[PDB]
Amino acid sequence: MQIKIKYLDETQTRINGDWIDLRAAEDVAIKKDEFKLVPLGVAMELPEGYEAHVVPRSSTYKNFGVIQTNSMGVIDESYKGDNDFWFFPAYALRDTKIKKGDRICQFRIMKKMPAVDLIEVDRL
Amino acid sequence: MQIKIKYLDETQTRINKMEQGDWIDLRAAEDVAIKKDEFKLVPLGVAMELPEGYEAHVVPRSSTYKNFGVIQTNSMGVIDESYKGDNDFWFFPAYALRDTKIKKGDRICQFRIMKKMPAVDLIEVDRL
Amino acid sequence: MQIKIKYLDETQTRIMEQGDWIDLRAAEDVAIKKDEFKLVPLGVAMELPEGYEAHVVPRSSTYKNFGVIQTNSMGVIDESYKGDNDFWFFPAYALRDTKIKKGDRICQFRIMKKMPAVDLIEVDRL
| Bridge partners, residue B116, by sequence | none
Q: Could you confirm whether C29 is annotated as catalytic?
A: no
Q: How far is CA B44 from CA A42, B32, B111, C58, in A?
A: 34, 11, 12, 20
Residues B42-81 as b/e (b if ≥16 CB within 10 A, e otherwise) read bbbbbbbbbeeebbbbbbbbbebbeebbbbbbbbbbbbeb
- Residues B65, B69, B72, CA angle at the centre, nearest 5°? 65
Q: Report d(CA C6, CA B118) in Å as an integer.
A: 21
Q: Report d(CA A122, CA A100) in Å as an integer.
A: 54
Whether the Cβ atoms of residue C56 and residue C110 lie closer than 8 Å to each other = no
Per DSSP, helices labelled H in C1-126 are 62-66
Query: In 10 A of CB A82, how many CB atoms?
Result: 11
Q: Report d(CA B14, CA B65) in Å as an integer.
A: 23
Q: Report d(CA B112, CA C69) in Å as an integer.
A: 22
Mind listing the domains of chain A with CATH numbers? Answer: 1-112 (2.70.40.10)
The catalytically annotated residue of B9, B80, B88, B99 is: B80
Resolution limit in angstroms? Answer: 1.7
Q: Report d(CA B114, CA B81) in Å as an integer.
A: 10
Mutate to test the interface with A, among C32, C48, C57, C73 (most CBs of A within 10 A): C73
State phi, psi for A63 to the nearest 5 degrees: -70, -40
User: DSSP readout, B36-79?
Assistant: TT-EEEEEEEEEEEPPTTEEEEEEE-TTHHHHH-EEETTSSEEE
Q: Which residues, other chains included, contact B66 with Cβ-Cβ below 8 Å and sequence gap of 6+?
A: none
Q: Which of C15, C16, C19 sits opposite B116 (nearest CB)?
A: C19
Q: How far is CA B103 from CA A62, A102, B5, B106, C89, in A?
A: 36, 38, 22, 6, 38
Strand-strand pairing, B2-7 and A116-120: parallel
Q: Where are the beta strands (DSSP E) in chain A?
A: 2-7, 20-23, 28-30, 35-39, 42-45, 50-56, 66-68, 73-76, 87-92, 96-98, 103-111, 116-120
Nearest to C77 by CA among C103, C124, C101, C109: C109
Q: Report d(CA B99, CA C15) in Å as an integer.
A: 41
- CB contacts, 8 Å: C1 with chain B: 118-121
Q: Report d(CA A79, CA A71) in Å as an integer.
A: 19
Task: Give the containing element (helix H, strand E) for A61.
Answer: helix A60-64
Whether the Cβ atoms of residue C78 and residue C31 lie closer than 8 Å to each other = no
Nearest to B64 by CA among B108, B105, B24: B108
> Based on the number of CB atoms within 10 Å of its own CB, is B83 exposed (0-12), middle (13-18) or buried (19 or more)?
middle
Whether the Cβ atoms of residue C32 and residue C38 lie closer than 8 Å to each other = yes
State phi, psi for C63 to the nearest 5 degrees: -70, -50
Experimental technique of record: X-ray
Q: Which residues, other chains included, contact C97 with Cβ-Cβ below 8 Å and sequence gap of 6+?
A: C32, C33, C34, C67
